[PDB]
C-alpha cells in the first residue's frame, strides 16, 4: 500500500484499527552532487520537479540563444562598415576583439 502524509488505516479481522502516517525521509542527499539532489526532490516532490526543470531549461535556452543572437548582430554591425570599404583595412583592436581576419 501507499501511505502518504495525510494518513492510512487498516483493520485485520478482529484487531483494532491501526493508523499510520508517512514522514518525509526521501532517498538521496539534498546537500551536494547535483544528480543526487534531483533524485531527492523527485522522490520528494514529483510533480513540481519536472515543471521546475522544464522552466529553468527553457529560460536558460532562451537566454543563451538570445545572447548569442545579440552578440552576432553586434559583431555584424561592427564589422560591416569596415568590410564595405574596397581596401578593407580593419584596425587591430577590433581584429582582436571581434575576431576578424
Amino acid at each position: 500500500f501507499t501511505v502518504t502524509e495525510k494518513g492510512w488505516e487498516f483493520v485485520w479481522g478482529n484487531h483494532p484499527p491501526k493508523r499510520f502516517w508517512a514522514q518525509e525521509t526521501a532517498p538521496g542527499n539534498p546537500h551536494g552532487l547535483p544528480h543526487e539532489v534531483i533524485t531527492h526532490y523527485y522522490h520528494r516532490y514529483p510533480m513540481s520537479t519536472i515543471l521546475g526543470l522544464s522552466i529553468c531549461a527553457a529560460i536558460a535556452t532562451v537566454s543563451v540563444a538570445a545572447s548569442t543572437w545579440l552578440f552576432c548582430r553586434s559583431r555584424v554591425a561592427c564589422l560591416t562598415p569596415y568590410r564595405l570599404t574596397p581596401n578593407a583595412r580593419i584596425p587591430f583592436c577590433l581584429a582582436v576583439l571581434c575576431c576578424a581576419r
Binding site: 508517512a22 518525509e24 546537500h31
Partner: protein, 442 residues
C-alpha cells in the same frame, strides 16, 4: 480585548498562542481539542426485519362451497379450491368424491425477533458540530463542551469565548441512512409504500410497535397436493436477509477524512477537515503590567538537536539574564516552528531548554520569549523512521525544504542567465552608439 484567531480541526494536538497588548505583559492562551462530534438532524421513517408468512387453517366443507371473506391483513391472499379429497390421520375426511372445497388463506406478519433484530431507515440533513475543548487562558483552565456555531459562548472568569462555525459544510452522512446493529450505511432505501419484493424494505413498519405494516412480498397461493391438508404458497425471499448478504461495508470503514461513526446518537468523530475560528472577549483585568513579570536582557539562542521529524524533534537552548525568577510565555510567531510548552519558568542567570517541531531543513525563526525576540538558527537532519503512528505536529510551509545547495543552483542557473542577457543588451547598445558615432563623420 477582542482577540480573534484560528484553530485547525484536529483532535489530540494542543494549540498554543499568546496575546500581546502593546504595553503590558503577554497573556498565553492554550486550547487542546479532545473530541469533536458531528450530529445530524436525524428523522426516522420506518424499520424493517424478516417477515413471517402466517397461514390460517384450511376451511374444508364436504359437498358444499365456501367463500372468500377478507380480513385486510398485509398482503392477504385468499383462494378457494374445488375438487379436493383430503386425508387426516384417522382416514379420509369427506365421503363426497367431488364438490368438496378447501380455502387457503395466507398473510404476511413480521417476525418474532423484530424487536432486537431490525434496521432503522432514517433521513439526515443539516448537521451540528460540537467539541470538547480544554481551554487555558492565563493559567485558568476549564474543560467544557463548547458548541461551534457562531454563538453560544463559554464563560469562565469573565472571559467570553465564541468558537465560530466550521469552514466546511461537509458531512459523511448522506440524505438517507440505514442503521443496523450499531453500524450505519449510506443506502438509498425506498420510501414508505414503495417497498419492492425481494429487496430492502419489502416489510415497512412505521415504528417498532406501529401495528400497521406495509408488505409487498410477492405472495401467491398454490393448489394443494391431492390428498393433503396444507396451505402451499410461493413468495420472494426475505429482502432484509438479501440486504444482509450483500451489505457494502459500513461507514465506519469507508468514511473520508478518517471519521469514527458511532451509534446511539448517530454522530461522526474526529473528522480532520475544516478549521474552527475563535473569538476571545477578554476583560481588561487579566492584562498584567510589564514590571510584574520577568524581562530578559542579553539573551542568546542555540540549537542542540534538530531533526525535522513529525513530533518535537528539535531542541533550542536559550542562555538568558533577567532580574526576576518567574515564568513567562514562549511563542513562535510564524508557523516555522511549533513549540511544545507554552511557558518557561526562569531563574535569574540559568538556561532554558525548549522543544520545537519543524519541517525545515535550514530553520531560521525568531523566538519570542518573555517580551523579547531572539533568533534561533540551525540545520535540521532527516529522521530515522519512514512511517510513524501519530499525526504531524507542524505545518508544511511552501518552500520549506529547499536546501541551500539547491538555492545556489537556482540562483546561478536562473539569475546568471539574466546577467548574460543584460551584458548582451549593454554590448548591443554600446555597438549601436559606436556605429552612430562612426557615421557622424560624413
Amino acid at each position: 480585548y477582542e482577540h480573534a484567531t484560528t484553530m485547525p480541526s484536529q483532535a489530540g494536538i494542543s494549540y498554543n498562542t499568546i496575546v500581546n497588548r502593546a504595553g503590558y505583559a503577554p497573556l498565553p492562551i492554550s486550547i487542546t481539542p479532545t473530541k469533536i462530534k458531528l450530529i445530524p438532524t436525524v428523522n426516522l421513517e420506518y424499520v424493517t426485519c424478516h417477515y413471517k408468512t402466517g397461514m390460517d387453517s384450511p376451511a374444508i366443507k364436504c359437498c358444499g362451497s365456501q367463500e372468500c371473506t377478507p380480513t385486510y391483513r398485509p398482503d392477504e391472499q385468499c383462494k378457494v379450491f374445488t375438487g379436493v379429497y383430503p386425508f387426516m390421520w384417522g382416514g379420509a375426511y369427506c365421503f363426497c368424491d367431488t364438490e368438496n372445497t378447501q380455502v387457503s388463506k395466507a398473510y404476511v406478519m413480521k417476525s418474532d425477533d423484530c424487536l432486537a433484530d431490525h434496521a432503522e431507515a432514517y433521513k439526515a440533513h443539516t448537521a451540528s458540530v460540537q467539541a470538547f475543548l480544554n481551554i487555558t487562558v492565563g493559567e485558568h483552565s476549564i474543560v467544557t463542551t463548547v458548541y461551534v456555531n457562531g454563538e453560544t459562548p463559554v464563560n469562565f472568569n469573565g472571559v467570553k469565548i465564541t468558537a465560530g462555525p466550521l469552514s466546511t459544510a461537509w458531512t459523511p452522512f448522506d440524505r438517507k441512512i440505514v442503521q443496523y446493529a450499531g453500524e450505519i450505511y449510506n443506502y438509498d432505501f425506498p420510501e414508505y409504500g414503495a417497498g419492492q419484493p425481494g429487496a430492502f424494505g419489502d416489510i415497512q413498519s412505521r415504528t417498532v410497535s406501529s401495528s400497521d405494516l406495509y408488505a409487498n412480498t410477492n405472495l401467491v397461493l398454490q393448489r394443494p397436493k391431492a390428498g393433503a391438508i396444507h396451505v402451499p404458497y410461493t413468495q420472494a425471499p426475505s429482502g432484509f436477509e438479501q440486504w444482509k448478504k450483500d451489505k457494502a461495508p459500513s461507514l465506519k470503514f469507508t468514511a473520508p477524512f478518517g471519521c469514527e461513526i458511532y451509534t446511539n446518537p448517530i454522530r461522526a468523530e474526529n473528522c480532520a477537515v475544516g478549521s474552527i475560528p475563535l473569538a476571545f472577549d477578554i476583560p481588561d483585568a487579566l492584562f498584567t503590567r510589564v514590571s510584574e513579570t520577568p524581562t530578559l536582557s542579553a539573551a542568546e539562542c542555540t540549537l542542540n538537536e534538530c531533526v525535522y521529524s513529525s513530533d518535537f524533534g528539535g531542541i533550542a537552548t536559550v542562555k538568558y539574564s533577567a532580574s526576576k525568577s518567574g515564568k513567562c510565555a514562549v511563542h513562535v510567531p510564524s508557523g516555522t516552528a511549533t513549540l511544545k510548552e507554552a511557558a518557561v519558568e526562569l531563574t535569574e542567570q540559568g538556561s532554558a531548554t525548549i522543544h520545537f517541531s519543524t519541517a525545515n531543513i535550514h530553520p531560521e525563526f525568531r523566538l519570542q520569549i518573555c517580551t523579547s525576540y531572539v533568533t534561533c538558527k540551525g540545520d535540521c537532519h532527516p529522521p530515522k523512521d519512514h512511517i510513524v503512528t501519530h499525526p504531524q505536529y507542524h505545518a508544511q510551509t511552501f518552500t520549506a525544504a529547499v536546501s541551500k545547495t539547491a538555492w545556489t543552483w537556482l540562483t546561478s542557473l536562473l539569475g546568471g542567465s539574466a546577467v548574460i542577457i543584460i551584458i548582451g543588451l549593454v554590448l548591443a547598445t554600446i555597438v549601436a552608439m559606436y556605429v552612430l558615432t562612426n557615421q557622424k563623420h560624413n
